[PDB]
Design a protein around this ligand. Sequence first.
Ligand SMILES: [Cl-]
Ligand SMILES: [Cl-]
Ligand SMILES: [Cl-]
Length: 130
Amino acid sequence: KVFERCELARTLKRLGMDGYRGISLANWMCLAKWESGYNTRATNYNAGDRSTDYGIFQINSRYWCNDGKTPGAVNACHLSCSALLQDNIADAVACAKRVVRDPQGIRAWVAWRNRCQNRDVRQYVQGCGV
Ligand SMILES: [Cl-]
Ligand SMILES: [Cl-]
Ligand SMILES: [Cl-]
């Protein structure tokens, strides 16, 4: 599915994302916006290293989920990458939390550095009741 902005914001808040390991909801919204345009079914093959990015946060198969087809991969979220293509984003959210338990935190996503870091991201949650 493609989420509407405020629906997603409320969905993530219910799933405990607000302030998770120091990360505001608006940072998570900005990440989802630039990764996928709020689209849970998005996939992107990386020809360069044989991995794929999955779902609303574009979580990468090399480290985070298993797709069977990425060489030398591990599966730190202990999920099929299929779980990251559901309309229900609970698994994706669990896996995004796992990503940010690592030292880099939200910096793991380069899109976050480019489009969100050191920016005014308040617009992402304006009006959403979160
Ligand atoms: Cl911030
Ligand atoms: Cl699974
Ligand atoms: Cl679903």
